[PDB]
Design a protein around this ligand. Structure first.
Ligand SMILES: [Fe+3]
Ligand SMILES: [Fe+3]
Lengths: 402, 404
């Protein structure tokens, strides 16, 4: 049996934020905790939420100390703030890090009796087994400011234990936000690199969700629609920025639609390896995926290859009388051209990772990627040896070949 | 602002019903009211639910008196049973009639003080309102288990009920009526006769077709409308011809009808449903057959921006050729639909559907006016004249293609 599980409400288009918040007000919420990071707090993004809520007599508090990774110490501090402030709605504001952090703060607030590493142990991934009851003390709203991680519609969160550096993925549909707000007025200032990295992150989400062993007829159409929107609007969004708000808005929705797909179909080894590259070498998550995705397609295309050919057909990249190999070659050629015009380097070496450093860690990276939660959904069951070959090829800029 | 609003949980594929019901049990529900019709009760469909729930110590009650249309007297009786039995979950089982009836029983149970009167008038459609729908989901959550493929009502905010005493129909629309969970288990549709398979499938085709060209279509509904159409193109003929011998085709079409529901729950429909409603109530034509008879002429009408969208559907379904322009792509979309109708045994005209000429001519003016006022008209990409709806109805009665 399969499922399609999403927030009850996803509000989108420019200007949806104040209208969605009016529903929060009319639903009777009186105490709102905003969870965000320092850049977004400092640059007025939290004010866009708190001004509307305060005008209606809602009490507000802002926790702005989440950084680039959700850490256990920061999550505990935010949960302690919730315990004292007692919100009846938590509003995550930002990219993947604040939204993921807010999900775990929410659990700890709803269930102060539970120890995190308890939860970390039992709810590592989606399977049948129960998650503690959520949404009694507070509802969860996610407001995304990049285009994007899709975390505003997913059951996933990761937090790093400061003391050990160990990452703990959590996954349960009780962590899916109650409402997602996708308002492109919040992304018109994104710099080019963040536009590129978030957009290729979204491409990767939809690509991995489409060929995942858990792909379904309920996820497939959203995955393909996300890819079509990104093909058609991501270059203009990157090049033109705020001068083309429609392109910015289309990509903002596309990243959420990719989230809808992978929230239910999950991902694959491109994310498994991207996680390890990013954390070891401090490469942005979207850049790591951009560097790996074409070799992962080459790897999975040896059924995934039929599915990749369908994506090429959907994106208008195929010609009359192409058979599968030629269609996949055209899908890869489109991705390499997209990466190039978005300023993505051609190798991890050209991303700034330098040779002795990479060879010292490549075996640990391969082993850890194998153990990553996203590996189980990949259409090809990997050998550690093979993940190492992909990583090396991607380091030196070679196409993966068997 | 646009939206994408659905049940929190949709469970699907063969065998999904017992797994979905285990979440109902582990969520702590102890009293379940099943709402269905007599055919489904008598043929063991309700047993598939109650056996699982009772084995877990959930108390169950089954209301099986829903008729072919939700009627106000039956809805009131089901609400009174709810008032006495006090369920903490209502489980609708069936096609559109039980699922729509259950939504209204739910309202009356949550809010017995409210006058149905009132609700029917204030909440006829989705719009911006100072006054909000009464709070739902306090006494009970709502689960919808669909047994046709299908109306999509398991994911929509819509319900209609007929006043027996007057014959007046009351459409209701609010996202507080959207079920909390939809269950789409094709083990419940393997015995559907050919005609129910055909009518339900072309209803689903029509939902997805109208949702795609609606003025409220969005990037969040568009991909689901296209996926529904693709699944229906690829599996509805085999589902119809082969039935239970091809469970994958029955299962694909069952998901496709729900996926079409996702699209039109959010993007709404158009004048094909407007006119089909009026054919159905006046001449007692099944809903999916009425839509099947009209959709091709509604496309011809809307294609006079709708024509570009229809061409995109033809491209998506693999129906266009190299160097086709818009007009040719739409012609190929229409040719595919006509061939699908023919092989599903759909008649070529309303006349061959059993309505005779004198009765049709006597009511066609009222039908055209009533269809215009139908709430599905507002989403149609072409704002109609009553004059034009009348022409479509006459052309469809006599089996002519609509031409401008
Ligand atoms: Fe990602
Ligand atoms: Fe319908």
């Amino acid at each position: 049996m399969l499922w399609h599980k999403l927030p009850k409400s996803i509000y989108f288009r420019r200007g949806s934020l104040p209208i969605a918040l009016d529903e929060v007000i009319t639903d009777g919420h009186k105490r709102a905790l905003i969870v965000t990071d320092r850049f977004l707090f400092n640059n007025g993004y939290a004010d866009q939420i708190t001004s509307v809520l305060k005008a209606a007599g809602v009490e507000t508090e802002v926790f702005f100390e989440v950084e680039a990774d959700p850490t256990l110490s920061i999550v505990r501090k935010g949960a302690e703030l919730a315990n004292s402030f007692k919100p009846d709605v938590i509003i995550a504001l930002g990219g993947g890090s604040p939204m993921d952090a807010a999900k775990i703060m929410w659990v700890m607030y709803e269930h102060p009796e539970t120890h995190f590493e308890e939860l970390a142990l039992r709810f590592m991934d989606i399977r049948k087994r129960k998650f503690p009851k959520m949404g009694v003390k507070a509802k969860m709203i996610a407001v995304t400011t990049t285009s994007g991680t899709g975390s505003e519609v997913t059951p996933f969160a990761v937090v790093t234990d400061d003391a050990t550096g160990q990452k703990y993925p959590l996954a349960d549909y009780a962590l899916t936000p109650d409402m997602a707000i996708v308002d492109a007025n919040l992304v018109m200032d994104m710099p080019k690199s963040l536009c590129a990295f978030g957009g290729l992150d979204a491409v990767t989400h939809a690509m991995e969700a489409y060929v995942s062993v858990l792909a379904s007829e309920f996820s497939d159409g959203q995955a393909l629609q996300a890819l079509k929107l990104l093909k058609e609007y991501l270059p203009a969004s990157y090049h033109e920025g705020s001068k083309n708000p429609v392109a910015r808005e289309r990509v903002h929705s596309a990243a959420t639609i990719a989230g809808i797909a992978f929230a239910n179909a999950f991902l694959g080894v491109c994310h498994s390896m991207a996680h390890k590259l990013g954390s070891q070498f401090h490469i942005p998550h979207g850049l790591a995926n951009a560097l790996l995705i074409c070799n992962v397609i080459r790897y999975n295309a040896n059924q995934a290859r039929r599915r990749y050919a369908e994506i090429a057909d959907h994106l208008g990249l195929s010609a009359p009388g192409d058979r599968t190999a030629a269609k996949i070659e055209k899908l890869l050629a489109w991705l390499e051209t997209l990466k190039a015009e978005l300023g993505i380097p051609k190798s991890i070496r050209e991303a700034g990772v330098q040779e002795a450093d990479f060879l010292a860690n490549v075996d640990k990276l391969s082993e850890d990627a194998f153990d990553d939660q996203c590996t189980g959904a990949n259409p090809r069951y990997p050998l550690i040896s093979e993940l190492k070959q992909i990583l090396l090829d991607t380091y030196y800029g070679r196409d993966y070949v068997e």
